[PDB]
């Protein structure tokens, strides 16, 4: 079956920038809509951003103006551009892709996560 895979995470300085990507290993399935979650060290998982099938985008209040979600449809990848980082952004970022068709059936899929650190 499919396995979503986040990447582009890592270490970055305060004020820095990162671009996370999320994709199905082997491009075997299309991703027409998706969202990003994050999990801080001692906090609750929270939504970060979302993009629908139509293209409509929504963000959390603590990231509007700074983050941008988008997708390259030709490579079934979804991106999260992250600008003007601050230590509050330090977290594990997860990728969520709903209702993906594979092997005769629809299913929701999650990535294993990717570390992001702002020191």
């Amino acid at each position: 079956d499919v396995q979503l895979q986040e990447s582009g995470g890592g270490l970055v300085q305060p004020g820095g920038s990162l671009r996370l990507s999320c994709a199905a290993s082997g491009n075997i399935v299309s991703i027409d809509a998706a969202g990003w979650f994050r999990q801080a060290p001692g906090k609750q998982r929270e939504p970060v951003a979302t993009i629908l099938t139509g293209g409509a985008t929504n963000y959390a209040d603590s990231v509007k103006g700074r983050f941008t979600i988008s997708r390259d449809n030709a490579k079934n990848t979804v991106y999260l551009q992250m600008n003007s980082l601050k230590p509050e952004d330090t977290a594990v970022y997860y990728c969520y892709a709903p209702m993906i068709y594979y092997g005769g059936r629809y299913s929701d899929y999650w990535g294993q996560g990717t570390q992001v650190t702002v020191s």
Binding site: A34, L52, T53, M99
Partner: peptide, 15 residues
């Protein structure tokens, strides 16, 4: 068409 609606509603529910 309906599938589109479902995907989007899954995402909009998150908020």
């Amino acid at each position: 068409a309906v599938e589109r609606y479902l995907k989007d509603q899954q995402l909009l529910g998150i908020w």
